Structures are given as C-alpha cells and as structure tokens.
C-alpha cells in the first residue's frame, strides 16, 4: 500500500483507539 | 642457554609466528604473575589451545632485528617490556579479548595495548573480529529493518506523544 495511507491512518486513527492500537502493536512484536 | 644460533632459532621461530600468524598482541608485563599463564592457558583448556604462545621476547634486538619477515613500524612497537602474542591457527578472534579483559582485572599492564600487526599499525584497541561466529549479532544488526526500527520510532509517539 501507499506509505501516505499508513501514515494518515496511524497518525490520525483517533486517540481513544490509537493509544490502544499502536501500543498493542508494541505488545505483539519486540 | 646458547649463542647467536639459539638467538636465530628463537627469532626465526617467534617471527614465523608473525609471518604465518593470524594475529598479534603486544603487552608490557610488570607484576606479571604465573596466574597469567594460568589465565591464557586456562582459556586454552575449553576455548583456546596449544595454537597460542606468548613468549617474552622483548629481548628486542633479537625479536626485532629478527623480522626480515616484514614487520614494519615495529621499532616504535619495541619500547620497554613487551610480551608478544601470536596465533598460527584458528580465528584471530578471541585472543585480543582474552588480554583486553585480562588487564582490566588489573592483571599486570596492557602497555595501553600498543597495537600490533595485521592491520600493520599504531595503538588503538578495536572491536574488529571478536564479533564473528556471533552472526546472531547480524540477525540483530538487520534490526528487523522494516519491523523493529518501526516499533522503535514509527511506534514511539503513542507512548511518548500525548502530552
């Protein structure tokens, strides 16, 4: 997929969702 | 002992260790113990072997004049006391470490590790080839690329961002 899509989403993706998203993505690998 | 013949023997041999040798380590020994031989040659039990020798040949005009075997810039590598360390077989890997973490246990003196051949140069202690057969270190040197370097920075914010 285009980089700007992943960037737009992972940047916005609200907050209430986002902090429970990217954090979980830090809780999956590494 | 013996004469100039014994000399020539000692030199042609110990500097053959510098000709066919894998690596070289120059170390000044003051307060050098028997527990030193009991260190390098104990590390020779399960890790190293008889593949290693360290003679004190800092007899200089013996061990230096005895390098038509082409060790240059070594006049400067001849000051004071030195214990020559040479490896015929095996990697050049672990030996440098053995002394590096020997002398830091106070273990005599390192001569500040004056440096020796196969760079063929002056004094600095580098990390070049302790790191081989460690290639898991390269497995982590990839840093996962697209993934772990992503979970470092691209996901950095959500934990460090709300402020």
């Amino acid at each position: 997929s285009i980089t700007k899509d992943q960037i737009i989403e992972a940047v916005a993706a609200m907050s209430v969702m986002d902090v429970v998203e990217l954090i979980s993505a830090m809780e999956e690998k590494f | 002992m013996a004469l100039n013949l014994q000399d020539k023997q000692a030199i042609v041999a110990e500097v053959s260790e510098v000709a066919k040798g894998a690596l070289s380590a120059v170390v000044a020994d003051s307060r050098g113990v028997t527990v030193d031989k009991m260190t390098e040659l104990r590390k020779a039990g399960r890790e190293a072997g008889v593949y290693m020798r360290v003679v004190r040949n800092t007899l200089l005009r013996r061990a230096v004049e005895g390098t038509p075997f082409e060790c240059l810039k070594d006049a400067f590598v001849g000051p004071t006391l030195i214990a020559y360390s040479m490896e015929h077989p095996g990697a050049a890997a672990r030996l440098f470490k053995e002394f590096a973490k020997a002398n830091a246990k106070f273990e005599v003196k390192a001569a500040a590790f004056e440096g020796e051949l196969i760079p063929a140069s002056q004094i600095d202690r580098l990390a070049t080839l302790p790191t081989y057969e460690e290639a898991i270190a390269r497995l982590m040197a990839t840093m996962k690329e697209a993934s772990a370097g992503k979970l470092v920075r691209t996901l950095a914010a959500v934990r460090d961002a709300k402020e």
Partner: protein, 141 residues
C-alpha cells in the same frame, strides 16, 4: 584466586567420612569445626561415591564455619581399586612388581578435565604416567 588465606588437606578415604581416630582434632584446628566437617562434604560426596581420597582447600575468614571447593582425587591411589595390589610402593625398583599399559589409565586421565595443566590432551597423559610409575610399575605402551 589470590595467594593464601587458609587451607589444609589431610584424610584417608571417602569410604568413611569425617573419621575421629585417624585425624580427629587434627582434621583441623582453625575455625574449622570437627563435627561440622560431616555436612558440606557428604552433601557432594554421597552425591557421587565413596572410597576415594578427597583433598580440598579450606577457605576461612572471620565467619563461623568454613567453605571448601573440591576438585579431584589423587591419581596415585587409583592403583588400589583398579590396577593391582592393595598397597603401594613396597619393594619398588628391586624387581618388576606391577605392570600397567597405555590402554588403562586413559579414561583415568580423562576424568579430570578441570584439573590438569595442559591444553594438549595428548600431553596430559604423560603426567599421570609417572603417577603410575612412583611404585615401580612398568608400562606397556
């Protein structure tokens, strides 16, 4: 290891641990306890076997009992269990009494891998060789 603090080795066999009559008050007088010699020893000893002499370093500073790190037995007393005669030297060089070979004493040399001076597994053989020759035993190589 540094140099010296304390240590001693005096004993007969592990078959009877902490013997009173052979040593007794002489097993040590330091700050080593005669009754307390029967614990930290038999802990490992009874964890492997008995009957072989086991010397050891005795490390004592200021505190109560002592700490001893055991390594290997003597290779001279290994001629009693598997070699030959129950005794020793006897009339050592006046006649050929016992005879061992290259085959035997090999795994005997192999048993101590933390106790040798050698990087050479070929060299560390001829060390124990003499240990077989102290009583005047001929070697068939």
């Amino acid at each position: 290891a540094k140099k010296v603090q304390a240590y001693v080795k005096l004993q007969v066999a592990a078959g009877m641990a902490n013997p009173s009559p052979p040593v007794g008050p002489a097993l040590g007088q330091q700050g080593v306890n005669i009754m307390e010699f029967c614990k930290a020893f038999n802990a490992k000893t009874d964890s492997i076997e008995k009957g072989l002499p086991i010397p050891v370093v005795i490390t004592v500073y200021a505190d109560r009992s002592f700490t001893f790190v055991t390594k290997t037995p003597p290779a001279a007393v290994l001629l009693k269990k598997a070699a030959g005669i129950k005794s020793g030297s006897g009339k050592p060089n006046k006649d050929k009494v016992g005879k061992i070979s290259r085959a035997q004493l090999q795994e005997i040399a192999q048993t101590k891998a933390a106790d040798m001076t050698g990087a050479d597994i070929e060299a560390m053989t001829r060390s124990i060789e003499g240990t077989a020759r102290s009583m005047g035993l001929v070697v068939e190589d």
